[PDB]
């Protein structure tokens, strides 16, 4: 009659783990995207060298 407890708990746990994995993946992707530009700058400096 109420929401299935096992299913709701499993869905909440899987949603939480998926959301944390998404958050860490997006944080890592933002960090690598921010870090990529200095590599392009270093490549430009190396081509100048």
């Amino acid at each position: 009659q109420l929401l299935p407890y096992v299913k709701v708990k499993d869905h909440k746990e899987k949603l939480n783990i998926y959301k944390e994995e998404y958050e860490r993946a997006k944080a890592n992707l933002r960090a690598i995207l921010k870090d990529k530009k200095p590599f392009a700058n270093t490549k430009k400096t190396l081509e100048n060298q």
Binding site: P38, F39, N41, T42, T45
Partner: protein, 51 residues
Amino acid sequence: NDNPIPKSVPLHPKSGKYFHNLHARDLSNIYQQCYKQIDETINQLVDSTSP
């Protein structure tokens, strides 16, 4: 640190080609020519001067 420019990097095969290509300029031929020139100049000077 700061700008990502490492002080040094391990050698690469493409870098190895340039390392092998790099060499000291060889002056052995120039030294031999200079020695021959000075020796012949001394030999010429031996009889060049009026007695």
